[PDB]
Ligand binder design. Sequence first.
Ligand SMILES: NC(=O)c1ccc[n+]([C@@H]2O[C@H](COP(=O)([O-])OP(=O)(O)OC[C@H]3O[C@@H](n4cnc5c(N)ncnc54)[C@H](O)[C@@H]3O)[C@@H](O)[C@H]2O)c1
Ligand SMILES: NC(=O)c1ccc[n+]([C@@H]2O[C@H](COP(=O)([O-])OP(=O)(O)OC[C@H]3O[C@@H](n4cnc5c(N)ncnc54)[C@H](O)[C@@H]3O)[C@@H](O)[C@H]2O)c1
Ligand SMILES: [Mg+2]
Ligand SMILES: [Mg+2]
Lengths: 354, 362
Amino acid sequence: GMEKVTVTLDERSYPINIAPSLYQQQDAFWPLTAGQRAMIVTNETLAPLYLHKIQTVLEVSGVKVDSIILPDGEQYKSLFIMNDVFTALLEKHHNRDTTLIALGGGVIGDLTGFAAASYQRGVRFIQVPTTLLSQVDSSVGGKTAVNHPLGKNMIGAFYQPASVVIDLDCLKTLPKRELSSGLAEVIKYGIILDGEFFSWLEENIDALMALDNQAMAYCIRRCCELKAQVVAADEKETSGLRALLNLGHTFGHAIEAEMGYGVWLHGEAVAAGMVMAAKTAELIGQFTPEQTDRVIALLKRAELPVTGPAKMQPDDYLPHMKLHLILPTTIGHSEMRSDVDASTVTAAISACIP
Amino acid sequence: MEKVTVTLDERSYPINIAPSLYQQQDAFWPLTAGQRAMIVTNETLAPLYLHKIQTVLEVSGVKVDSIILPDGEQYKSLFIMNDVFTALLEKHHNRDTTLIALGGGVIGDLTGFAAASYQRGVRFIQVPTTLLSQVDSSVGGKTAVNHPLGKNMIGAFYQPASVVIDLDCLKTLPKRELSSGLAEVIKYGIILDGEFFSWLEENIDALMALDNQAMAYCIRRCCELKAQVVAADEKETSGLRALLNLGHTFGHAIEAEMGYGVWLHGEAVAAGMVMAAKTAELIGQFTPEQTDRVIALLKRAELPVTGPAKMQPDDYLPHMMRDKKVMGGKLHLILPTTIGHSEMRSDVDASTVTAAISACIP
Ligand SMILES: NC(=O)c1ccc[n+]([C@@H]2O[C@H](COP(=O)([O-])OP(=O)(O)OC[C@H]3O[C@@H](n4cnc5c(N)ncnc54)[C@H](O)[C@@H]3O)[C@@H](O)[C@H]2O)c1
Ligand SMILES: NC(=O)c1ccc[n+]([C@@H]2O[C@H](COP(=O)([O-])OP(=O)(O)OC[C@H]3O[C@@H](n4cnc5c(N)ncnc54)[C@H](O)[C@@H]3O)[C@@H](O)[C@H]2O)c1
Ligand SMILES: [Mg+2]
Ligand SMILES: [Mg+2]
């Protein structure tokens, strides 16, 4: 079906529209209108699949389109690459009324967003996310950035899109491993914020894996709804409410750091991380094995790992991680708990060794 | 000590102005003991003021790192800004750090955008060391770096936490740069406050001599005036803020044709304001007596009131049009209406512009 989320943050409002074949609808790329310009930023993987189609629809609507195609990879989320986007914009004489269109995943999304924030101190930005992860995570919060060699996402801006266009057909070309990686973050929302959504996932996860339009549209809509509610409740990260979004990410970062880029995908590491966080919550005396087993079972349904790499030992995790962890309190409720003992965390990691 | 409080885009900050302010109690508020700062400066200012400022901060309990960048508009680049990020990350500066911009407007813009972008925004304090940056950069929140295809094309609106103006720093500023700053001082009087203009006619000698009491009042009032115009035209579009471009359309032509550093920005603005005055005479809104007052005061500040001998009227016009597209070619000018009042005039005839330029040929 067609789902729609209106997000209202920092006194902005924008729509997220979600439907199969959305790229082909009239005014799907609103607020762009006839006579205006757009610069599509995409990567070498997405370009042959969607760039021509999108350019055609925009140009039939009176919109003048330029494009820049970047290589595929996290390493291109760079200040030097963002400068090349500025060069493309300036070489084609794009003025402050241009719109940047991020056609791709979260890598493209982050780089383009920061480019839109910074070009002439801010031009309009439309997200066209093509991974499940970016549909359910990047589409809300306004975080844009590029990397520095000494820290990921260290250079950037809070900058909100004018609209987010989610055509579910784009998921038909997404590798299944990337689809599952996105579903780790989908499941996370259920654990941290909405136990009823978790139950809905238990009942519909097979349809999501099959790219069912009705399930996936609702799935995306609810994740965005949940994310927008938590960002709205602490837009300046006052409380630790936005921090809850990091369930499994402390453990997961350790895995990504030791294993290297593309070896474990982000959502795969987060999946194993959520289990380790659940086990931690059991050991401090606040979670039951039955609750943890529900998290484990559902992750396996989504074809996600629930064990750590055999290749790392527990002592390899902690240098990457006295300790601040996001822990579940129920299925549907969570907390930031600081001062967790390292031996508690290592015991939890040890319980997930294959 | 003068103080201006500025409140724009729901932020509020003080601009404090005094001789020997670098040495005074809580001069770098809101930085407080136990916090970190990274001072960004250039190779010219570093031997003059970096040690002094570091000492005062460290005596206040503030932990200080610094980076020294090369001096010049040609270094106001994304790539040089990247070195700031590297210095911050190498010393493990977290989101609670403060960037201190110690230098002129070039340092101020690059540091400001660095502060806007580092971890998506850290605190920023301005320590402007040119008159131009004291009276122009200190309000508005425009930060930026240049791209080879356009000046100030990459940046952010980002306001400082405070602006620290120690008048003593002007004692080392070259006299030509002091005059260039006084062009923008005089502009304020023309566009917004005729009583300030009259005060300038009575005090310009003291300002040229760096009199502390005059200069403190001069800087306070300019910041006040710029803040009033920006605050009114934040939520309105149109362009009350565009009034800040008096003389800048003519002046950009001069800077563009004469080349980098040949005419300083305020020298070009000076001659531009005269041309704008002449234009306002020719459309029937200004008198020669009014224009004469502008000319006389500019000369007292050692600024030009004529265009370069090398440029003819047709050399100005391609630079003054919004662009050269078929639907472009339009000359939009800020004109004075009195001494103290100004307006945007759209679609000014080329013959009027050529006559006004011609009236200022040496
Ligand atoms: N709030 C935020 O701004 C936010 C949130 C989470 C993640 N991020 C950032 O997002 C990035 C990760 O994003 P991602 O997981 O979407 O990875 P990604 O953008 O690298 O895309 C994953 C892979 O799938 C390819 N791909 C994408 N869409 C496709 C499609 N429809 N068909 C075929 N292949 C396709 C990409 O080319 C790439 O090879 C990280 O840089 C992360 O920091 C940002
Ligand atoms: N609102 C804004 O953000 C805004 C407004 C006006 C100008 N600007 C920018 O400011 C820049 C021009 O600034 P500027 O005129 O200060 O030039 P500048 O920063 O290049 O300084 C002029 C010269 O004086 C030297 N210097 C500065 N202070 C000194 C002192 N106390 N003693 C000895 N030498 C000193 C500098 O090192 C430089 O050589 C431009 O890039 C312009 O875009 C921005
Ligand atoms: Mg994540
Ligand atoms: Mg100026």
